[PDB]
Structure 1
Amino acid sequence: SEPPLHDFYCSRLLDLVFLLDGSSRLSEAEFEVLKAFVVDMMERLRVSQKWVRVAVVEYHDGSHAYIGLKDRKRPSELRRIASQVKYAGSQVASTSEVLKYTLFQIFSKIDRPEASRIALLLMASQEPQRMSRNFVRYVQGLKKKKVIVIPVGIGPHANLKQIRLIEKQAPENKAFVLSSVDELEQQRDEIVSYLCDLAPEA
């Protein structure tokens, strides 16, 4: 076990998934800022199987899960793993494929009905139209499992059309549209407060 590093600490029943855009729309430096944001967020959550569980997935044309909700590791080790996520700089970053992964590989088997489910979709690009056929269906599938999707649009290449579609699916699906990764730290606490408020108290 490890104590909180800050006074601001979400201590509720929540399963939170960080989905990171691995496309080259973000430079290696910007991706580091994105990871720093993820780490900063994690520090403000009571990470534990009995409180806030976390998952981290980097998506390109396919995806790489670095941390799974059930991974029983020290919060500090989980944060270290997140800080070490490798920069992909891929030509394509499919939001449809990563939402499919979230729906069928993260929240397929609900081992924790007592926790709220949230997917923080950090987007900086637009996937090829040929990969979006089931986009709306996966978002609706998530909605039906009460998996709240919070899209964070970063920069002008972010898929704003999909962000808007996501917001439309469920009231809790709130979007955060930022001009760049440098604005993430500015809105971090607001984002944490929003999602923590969504989760049940123990």
Structure 2
Amino acid sequence: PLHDFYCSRLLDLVFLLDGSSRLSEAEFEVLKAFVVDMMEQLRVSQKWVRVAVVEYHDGSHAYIGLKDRKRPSELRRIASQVKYAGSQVASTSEVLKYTLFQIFSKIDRPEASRIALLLMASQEPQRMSRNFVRYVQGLKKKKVIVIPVGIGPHANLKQIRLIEKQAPENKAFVLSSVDELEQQRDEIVSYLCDLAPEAPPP
């Protein structure tokens, strides 16, 4: 497809997909299509621009890692085929914990912007949220920018605001449904473009 604009950046981008039942299977497909769209706009190639894709419910399910050496079209295919979980619980604390310690532990590429796109449609039980702030602060020290995208009326707004207060760069986006993903995609991608260092078009 022909998107409204494209940009190549020195960027490490992690997609974190809410795998709760707050999204129907059809709505989850819209979320996945949004992820593929962003990958196309950002000209993802695992060279100058690298991506990871994680679906999270009770735990993290990693479909793509930043160092996976696969051709772009395969990356996009993998992301589009991420399996719908539809679980009762999608723990934001666990997936940020996972991101902090298992994805962004070592800064091999310090010149690159590091971004965790946290796509939220649910609200974990407060029992699991004890170390939530510690993990967001942890990512801050790792120079990882956390971008929470709230989708629907069941998004954990309290945690979204908490993410914003930890660091000025942590910009939040609040959407009424998955239908607004494509409508606000340009704004989200634009923010990434103005944020990250420029890369050569491949």
The interval holding the TM-score normalised by the smaller chain is over 0.9
> Which of the numbers 58, 64, 68 marks the counterpart of 2:65?
68
Higher alpha-carbon deviation: 7-16 or 172-181: 7-16
Q: Structure 2: where are the runs of 5+ without partners? A: none
| Cα contact 2:46–2:72 (8 A) shared by 1 | no
Task: Give, in angstroms, the shift of residue 95 of structure 1.
Answer: 0.2
d(CA) in 2 for partners of 1:126 and 1:183? 20
Q: Distance in 1 between matches of 2:180 and 2:3?
A: 21
Report SS of the residue matched to 1:16: strand
Percent of aligned pairs with the same amino acid: 99
Say whether the 8 Å CA contact 2:20–2:122 is kept in structure 1. Answer: yes
Q: Deviations over 1:120-154 (max 9, x none)?
A: 00000000111001000000000111100000000
Tell me the TM-score normalised to structure 2 length. Answer: 0.95
**Cα distance, 1:31 vs. partner?**
0.3
Q: Deviations over 1:61-85 (max 9, x none)?
A: 1110000011111111100000000
**Post-superposition shift, 1:113?**
1.2
Deviates more, 1:63-72 or 1:41-50: 41-50
1:156-181 CA-to-partner distances (Å, cap 9, x unmatched) read 11000000000111111000000000
CA distance, structure 2, for counterparts of residue 5 and residue 82 of structure 1 = 19
User: What secondary structure is seen at the aligned counterpart in 1 of 2:51?
Assistant: strand
What is the number of equivalent residue pairs in this alignment? 199
Aligned 8 A contact 1:143 1:169 in 2: yes
TM-score (norm 1): 0.95
CA distance in 1, matches of 2:26, 2:45: 30
Q: Structure 1 CA distance, aligned partners of 2:118 and 2:131?
A: 17
Q: How has the CA–CA distance of structure 1 residues 194 and 16 changed in structure 2, closer, same or farther, with 3 Å as cutoff?
A: same
- Cα deviation for residue 102 of structure 1 reads 0.7
Query: Which deviates the most, 48-57 or 13-22?
Result: 48-57
Task: Work out the CA distance in 2 between the residues paired with 1:51 and 1:163.
Answer: 29
Runs of 4+ in structure 1 off by over 4 angstroms are 4-7
Measured on the aligned residues, the alpha-carbon RMSD in Å equals 1.3
Gaps of 5+ in 1: none
Shift of 1:17: 0.4
Per-residue deviation at 1:7?
6.8
Q: Does the aligned pair in 1 maintain the 2:90–2:123 contact within 8 Å? A: yes
Partner deviation per Cα, 1:36-64 (whole Å, 9 max, x = no partner): 00011101112234311000000001110
